Design a protein around this ligand. Sequence first.
Ligand SMILES: Nc1ncnc2c1ncn2[C@@H]1O[C@H](COP(=O)(O)OP(=O)(O)OC[C@H]2O[C@H](O)[C@H](O)[C@@H]2O)[C@@H](O)[C@H]1O
Ligand SMILES: Cc1cc(F)c(Br)cc1NS(=O)(=O)c1ccc(NS(=O)(=O)c2cc(Cl)cc(Cl)c2)cc1C(=O)O
Ligand SMILES: [Zn+2]
Length: 282
Amino acid sequence: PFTADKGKCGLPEIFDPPEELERKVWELARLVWQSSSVVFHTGAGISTASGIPDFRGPHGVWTMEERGLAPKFDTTFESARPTQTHMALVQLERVGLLRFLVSQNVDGLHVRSGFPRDKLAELHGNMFVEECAKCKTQYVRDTVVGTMGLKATGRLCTVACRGELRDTILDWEDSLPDRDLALADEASRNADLSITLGTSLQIRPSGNLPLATKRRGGRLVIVNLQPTKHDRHADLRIHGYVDEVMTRLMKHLGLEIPAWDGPRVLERALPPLPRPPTPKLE
Ligand SMILES: Nc1ncnc2c1ncn2[C@@H]1O[C@H](COP(=O)(O)OP(=O)(O)OC[C@H]2O[C@H](O)[C@H](O)[C@@H]2O)[C@@H](O)[C@H]1O
Ligand SMILES: Cc1cc(F)c(Br)cc1NS(=O)(=O)c1ccc(NS(=O)(=O)c2cc(Cl)cc(Cl)c2)cc1C(=O)O
Ligand SMILES: [Zn+2]
């Protein structure tokens, strides 16, 4: 806890120049159009543009710790809006282009964006989610559950039970939720394209899942300002703001980024909407 290995913090940011940046986003478009089963892996870098600091970025929680400095929030967890990237992943799932969403993030913004919970693995847990120790029923609350490290929150289960509610925030020592991990692994193994957005990929087994897509000839794309643990295994590496990359990507795909009505929870994915027809590529 004190002893925790927080890995490489504060590594230098890489900026692809705009012409290389444009070519790499086009190649990502082409990879998406070709792929049967696309899986997205997200980390703390997709929420920076909403006021939530990352862990190992220049002003990351762990980076600032190392330097004796505090990280800076520009929002509360309750008042944070989903970014353009968050809302773009909502859309890609609605049009059948995203098969599964693997996230390390505990900030709750994927669920609040309206992303279907049955297409999402929250590997590190969710600050707004508490779980009944007895019956395992999960509640998605409108305010952060006030504990971390799988502690009693002080509420009881109301299922048709009176189980002790606990938080879903993993401590360093805690093994990942078997269901979210099982579904994350299945999805990664069978994908022909895994796209990483704003994770350094330093945490086991979280950061290793996209590499499983590389077995049986799957392609891996890493989108990240900093070097990441698996850069050498990437077919494509894009060094740029994820919001800039995903907005350029959506325009290539001919998709609008949808409006956020405010915090909403969707347990199950809706039937797939229409999507633009595919370009001739070869
Ligand atoms: N706007 C941006 N666009 C692109 N990349 C960005 C942006 N902002 C930040 N980054 C990059 O985003 C990356 C964020 O990487 P890390 O900070 O390690 O977060 P994790 O999700 O991988 O941390 C995993 C776990 O480790 C912790 O212990 C917690 O448990 C986490 O759950 C950095 O390389 C940034 O350069
Ligand atoms: C909870 C959280 C979610 C995020 F998405 C981001 Br970004 C940051 C945070 N928290 S933080 O500010 O940066 C943040 C990071 C770490 C900890 N410490 S700890 O691991 O839980 C811990 C402390 C002690 Cl004394 C014993 C044990 Cl066994 C564990 C607290 C906070 C916080 O809330 O004060
Ligand atoms: Zn219960």
